[PDB]
Design an enzyme around this catalytic site. Structure first.
Site, short mmCIF file in Angstrom:
data_model
loop_
_atom_site.label_atom_id
_atom_site.label_comp_id
_atom_site.label_asym_id
_atom_site.label_seq_id
_atom_site.Cartn_x
_atom_site.Cartn_y
_atom_site.Cartn_z
N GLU B 48 0.83 -1.20 0.00
CA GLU B 48 0.00 0.00 0.00
C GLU B 48 0.87 1.26 0.00
O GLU B 48 0.68 2.15 -0.84
CB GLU B 48 -0.96 -0.02 1.20
CG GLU B 48 -2.07 1.05 1.10
CD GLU B 48 -3.12 0.70 0.04
OE1 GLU B 48 -3.32 -0.51 -0.22
OE2 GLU B 48 -3.74 1.62 -0.53
N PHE B 74 1.52 -13.62 -0.61
CA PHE B 74 2.75 -13.89 0.12
C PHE B 74 3.32 -15.19 -0.42
O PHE B 74 2.67 -16.23 -0.30
CB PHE B 74 2.50 -13.97 1.62
CG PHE B 74 1.41 -13.07 2.11
CD1 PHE B 74 1.57 -11.69 2.07
CD2 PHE B 74 0.23 -13.60 2.63
CE1 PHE B 74 0.56 -10.84 2.52
CE2 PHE B 74 -0.78 -12.75 3.09
CZ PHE B 74 -0.62 -11.37 3.03
N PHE B 75 4.51 -15.12 -1.04
CA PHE B 75 5.09 -16.27 -1.74
C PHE B 75 6.15 -17.02 -0.95
O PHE B 75 6.39 -18.19 -1.24
CB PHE B 75 5.72 -15.84 -3.06
CG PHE B 75 4.72 -15.41 -4.08
CD1 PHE B 75 3.86 -16.33 -4.64
CD2 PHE B 75 4.62 -14.09 -4.46
CE1 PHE B 75 2.92 -15.94 -5.57
CE2 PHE B 75 3.70 -13.69 -5.40
CZ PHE B 75 2.84 -14.62 -5.94
#
Lengths: 125, 125, 125, 125
Positions: B48, B74-75
């Site tokens: 953001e 979220f990887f």
């Protein structure tokens, strides 16, 4: 007891059941973005926190949950003047490997301020 | 100079152009969730922040931007051990009323840790 | 009376109120993807159709609605064997310029097969 | 050879590599919504198709991919007058269990008409 970032957010959990979690919190001066309204990331972080609490409580001793994704809409500006916000996570899907929860953040009047969908992965024992 | 929540996140902006914004930051003990990894809301908040900085700089004196929605994946788990993260916001669409930016958060190796799409509204003068 | 793509989808609307729209439809051979289950785009298209019908009916003669974005999760494989699906659009936010609707697609048993959130813009007269 | 719904969409694949897939298609009368522009579900379905083709080709004989979710933004109205659209899927994340691809749909001028992110699950042998 829920982690240091959740403490910083000021969340106070009223209920954490396998099927619902409810937390209260308030807009604060340090949580604002440059024009006097709540930073949008705070909405996302609260959605993440409240859904993760519920997902964890639903998985129980069976395993651990890991955030996968978070999609939050901001519907109205929240300020310090707006008082106490209530965030409620409700289950959308709770299966073997995945959970999805829906979190609504409302003001005292029931005005929906923000809403987020949180997908989490079940890491089972 | 970017607001009090952005300060708390520890973001340090390297570039804020009308077409790209870049910030560095690090995982910290107070930003973690109960199992020693970065709270997912922090990823959303950074996405953001970095996208809003770029959107604001692109709109310039023509008006002001307001967050609309934020979808962050979220990887990989990020920890204190992972060192310095770099978040880069790139434009997807910049029009009359709407902007969409894509923010990738990578580690020192170029491993994509998180990625978010941020939709913002242009409030024009 | 709802357009040629909606006809091709086989949607049959049971209710189109300013606060809810309900349509029935079925998986078909021509709607499948190579491994015998419903193509995922069909789920998105049905979510788009059912939410747009409701949004249009809520805006009424006041203006026209234009799709902005569509986020659909697919929770279970749907096949021809699964029978009749019911898609229900419920309002999340209905304001001056924006609407958001939530569409759940369920089977005969109430099993949630897919769910989508649809953001639309109000083009007012 | 890609399924019956993909045939109905009119997609013509120019490239399907483990790292990129490209398809051409056109707005048609039967793909429109009541006010003469492309039904939004068609954009989602094309995004799903082009990303799934790439994900499948990347997983190869190692397993099969199943759609998980699809988030598509519509940035400009597409009509029959707009000619030939080109949809390009690019990889965001390709790991053990999950893939995420980003699909941009552009017109002849390079104007971005729609863009979607597609999360898929790897069902490995």
């Amino acid at each position: 007891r829920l982690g240091p970032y959740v403490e910083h957010l000021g969340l106070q959990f009223e209920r954490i059941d396998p099927d619902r979690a409810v937390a209260y919190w308030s807009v604060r001066a340090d949580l604002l973005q440059p024009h006097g309204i709540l930073h949008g990331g705070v909405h996302c972080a609260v959605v993440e926190s409240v859904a993760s609490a519920a997902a964890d409580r639903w998985l129980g001793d069976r395993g651990t949950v890991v955030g996968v994704s978070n999609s939050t809409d901001f519907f109205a500006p929240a300020t310090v003047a707006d008082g106490r916000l209530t965030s409620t996570a409700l289950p959308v899907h709770r299966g073997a490997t995945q959970q999805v929860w829906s979190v609504e953040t409302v003001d005292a009047a029931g005005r929906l301020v923000a809403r987020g969908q949180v997908r989490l992965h079940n890491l089972r024992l």
